[PDB]
């Protein structure tokens, strides 16, 4: 994918999401030439702007340097902007004409990016499929989360998008996915007989899937209330972790095979009520800071009396022979004590204790971020004149995660993007939970800003059987 | 064992073995005070000497400094010497009287050290049992290798020693044993479900037990001939490695249980034929600088036309449910390429190769010496944009081995010393082969001083199933 021209159409160029994360990401990719050499960027938005205005409002987040001002002005040499509405065939045809009025725009692999408001996904995708299809190269679409709110809405959206594009063209992206050691966990799991056969019900006691954040929801508090942590990260990213941990032997490790194993695991998950769900929400930190002094409900853009949770702890199980009866854990949140993303595989104790109850349950952490590291906290003898062992952390282990994911979109690798049927089954899993949520509006348990999360989650892992040192 | 007085009776104080290795070892242990505070040394030999003569003849090897000259003279302040023959009750009673004429010599735990020549073991042990027994404290002895030559001689000698002392008062020592990395193998085997359940026939492909020595037998070539590498290191040290690796369901880590499981494993191995044997012997190096210019047969003290081997590779296959049908490899020798003592636990390949045959058989090396270190050469993905793994050496990891074994003899820990019945069964499984050896005088295959050993050993590893990459 380094020869044929590509177009990275950023719908919503004036959008805050674009200007804050997408344009700086493609700048990072373009200063180092990770995108293909003949890469075009064609923004699009309602507001009538220009390339100079884009420069003026986006340079500070690009944070370029006088050393590579030349590379910067080459980066804007590939840029362009188109003005139009989101539901009008006239402006859509104008966008198509502008795209075709480039270096083989029709031949260019139009890699659409939907950074536009969530309320229009249906209409924008319908217009894109009707008018903005190039019949030469692949036309992938990047749909940003979330993909509906409950089972019925998600099914309708998925069926519409399936009737428009095929799954080879739909790319459901997840920003938080590391893709660096979510990829290394696969190698560790498959290329070992040390971890291979003990990847079953008898040996691995449980799996803890954690994704914490150090910052709250300052400013953009009006986007999280309608959605909730479950639909934001818990149902997409934590299920991605759970599926890539619980998947059976793919036997060909391709994207389709791994997603099919994900579908098999998910189809092997029974219904989940509130009995395996815990919710939590944060409030003002008494030891305040520049942004910690105000809680979630202190954000003026958040509607008063909103029961949207920012912490979700759920336990899943897989009803197949390899994973029969063995538990899995999902934990996440925002504004927690410290940024982290780990997958702790706690193994069973060896049947028959001989070190006088000193045997600690062997672990295997995959700390996706920050300071990426994989380590097995196995236990070995301490040097000296003794015999007793000590639990020791044994380390076993570069574009950023988001630009790596965009590069994977360019390459065509759909390993880490949820499938239509995978999403359908995933929503089927939590349909009772989501219906209860939208019916009764459950009240999450308050927790302190920058804490470790509600104690009910740790109690949930304890009920599962997870052992905390 | 820091209050009651101890005596380290070095029979053969004028002996070369004593003056070269035992007295410097107890000096190393005494400058740091690892012997009990009220420890005594009472040598003994045919030739008449004195403490000053011992000082003059043994000072240079202590490699001490004038700063610790005070500690050295304190170390010789507790030394002693008794003159007498090895087979005379009169001199034995003189020795006993000298012992009783000390600071509670009768109460002292006489820790005898049979460093005296092998040809007299029967008579010396009989006299020691008859006369030199203190009836107050424990009276252990350290019996040095080899423990007989064939099945019948070994059985007679072991039965006599059993009739004299119980198995609590016998220590079949093995200098080469590390006592540290062997000690960590036990922990790595027991305190993990990472290695525990896969410690069976289906997962561990084979085990390689290796022990090499860069220096030959210059000068002392008249000692190795009558014994052979099998009876020197293979049948003691390499079988100790095999028992520690293979023993089933050890139970309490105590000496009794570990040695019982050693007995069970050795009862679960059948007779060794000539078909599982490789022998080798070394010759001089044209390119060598020091001793390498002369080979084993170049030693004037070696009888001409001697077929004693210095390299022996024999594989065992323990026949019980946990280890049914597995290869266990023994490799050893002298004058090899470089010092080493490793246990390479090569596991099976995962059934179903999905990384396009990039999967290398997972290993686990336990380097006993030099530079003790455990590293699992497991395979993980190297950082990059490709979904490919790399075989990476992942490290897992203080007197020396002889000091720690002497301390073990002082403490009473008999986990590292071969048992009477264990020795009987090892000689029973080597009986047909050893009788054929003594009958036909097999000719070992020549190999180069300082090489890696005869190629037939690697052929043996390949035949049993060991994979070399």
UniProtKB/Swiss-Prot annotation, chains A, B:
InterPro entries according to UniProt: G6P_DH, G6P_DH_AS, G6P_DH_C, G6P_DH_NAD-bd, NAD(P)-bd_dom_sf
Modification sites for Phosphotyrosine: 468
Assigned keywords, A-Z: Acetylation, Carbohydrate metabolism, Cytoplasm, Disease variant, Glucose metabolism, Hereditary hemolytic anemia, Hydroxylation, Membrane, NADP, Oxidoreductase, Phosphoprotein
Effect of residue 22 to T: In CNSHA1; Aures; class II
Free-text description of this protein's post-translational modifications in UniProt: Acetylated by ELP3 at Lys-377; acetylation inhibits its homodimerization and enzyme activity. Deacetylated by SIRT2 at Lys-377; deacetylation stimulates its enzyme activity.
Outcome when changing residue 390 to K: In CNSHA1; Tokyo; class I
UniProt binding sites for NADP(+) 1: 12-19, 46, 121, 145
Result of changing residue 367 to H: In CNSHA1; Nashville/Anaheim; class I
Variant or mutagenesis effect after changing residue 80 to C: In CNSHA1; Vancouver; class I
Effect of residue 295 to V: In CNSHA1; Bhavnagar; decreased enzyme stability
Modification type N6-(2-hydroxyisobutyryl)lysine: residues: 145
Pathway info: Carbohydrate degradation; pentose phosphate pathway; D-ribulose 5-phosphate from D-glucose 6-phosphate (oxidative stage): step 1/3
Xref: Gene3D superfamilies: Dihydrodipicolinate Reductase, domain 2, NAD(P)-binding Rossmann-like Domain
EC number of the protein: 1.1.1.49
Tissue: Isoform Long is found in lymphoblasts, granulocytes and sperm.
GO biological process: cellular response to oxidative stress; cholesterol biosynthetic process; erythrocyte maturation; glucose 6-phosphate metabolic process; glucose metabolic process; glutathione metabolic process; lipid metabolic process; NADP metabolic process
Annotated phenotype, changing residue 145 to Q: Inhibits catalytic activity. Does not impair dimerization
UniProt miscellaneous comment: Binds two molecules of NADP. The first one is a cosubstrate (bound to the N-terminal domain), the second is bound to the C-terminal domain and functions as a structural element.
Descriptive protein name: Glucose-6-phosphate 1-dehydrogenase
Annotated organism of origin: Homo sapiens (Human)
UniProt gene name: G6PD
